[PDB]
């Protein structure tokens, strides 16, 4: 059944401004800014307060009102990113060969390089995304810390490592090596 009205609410904190025009959302806050283009979903944003924002869909069908909650979650992630940030922690794991990890600056952008992945000789390089800030632990020595505002880029650049550091033509029940995500927290909290 096509519905009549289905709405969600978004609680904007203090000092966060949410400029919207033609479904191009732009959230500015203490940490940074974040823009998004939602011109593939038929949605109406209407402001009621500086403290919260209402989003609405009419005539539904369990597709548009399915994507509505997704939009809500996206905007919530965008808002908590510019305030609490995102901080991903990925741990090394090796049986025999230490995975020597480093950061490099090639002719173009910065990259992250790994060596001795199971006694290999291939130099696996991954491009850091444009937003992330990538560092190495100091309380321990086998941990890499991704950080940023866009979880959509941070988790992706995290997954790229875990994908390139995979095992091939061997049994994975036995061969457990690479870089593996442990924690997905925020910077401040």
């Amino acid at each position: 059944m096509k519905y009549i009205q289905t709405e969600q609410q978004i609680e904007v904190p203090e000092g966060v401004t949410v400029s919207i025009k033609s479904r191009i959302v732009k959230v500015v806050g203490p940490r940074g800014t974040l823009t998004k283009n939602l011109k593939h979903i038929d949605v109406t944003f209407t402001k009621v307060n500086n403290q919260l924002i209402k989003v609405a869909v009419h005539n539904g069908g369990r597709k548009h009102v399915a994507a509505l909650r997704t939009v809500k979650s996206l905007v919530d992630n965008m808002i908590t990113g510019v305030t609490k940030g995102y901080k991903y922690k990925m741990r090394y794991v090796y049986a025999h060969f230490p995975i020597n990890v480093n950061i490099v600056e090639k002719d173009g952008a910065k990259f992250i390089e790994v060596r001795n992945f199971l006694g290999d000789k291939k130099i696996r390089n991954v491009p850091v995304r444009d937003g992330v800030t990538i560092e190495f632990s100091t309380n321990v020595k086998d941990e890499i810390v991704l950080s940023g505002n866009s979880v959509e880029d941070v988790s992706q650049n995290a997954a790229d490592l875990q994908q390139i550091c995979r095992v091939r033509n061997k049994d994975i029940r036995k061969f457990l090596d690479g870089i593996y995500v442990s924690h997905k927290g925020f910077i401040t909290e």
């Binding site: 904007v12 203090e14 000092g15 966060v16 401004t17 949410v18 400029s19 919207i20 025009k21 033609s22 479904r23 109406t44 944003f45 209407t46 402001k47 500086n50 924002i53």
Partner: peptide
């Protein structure tokens, strides 16, 4: 803060 500009349609 600054007024969150939100306009789609009326």
């Amino acid at each position: 803060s600054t007024d969150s500009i939100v306009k789609a349609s009326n």
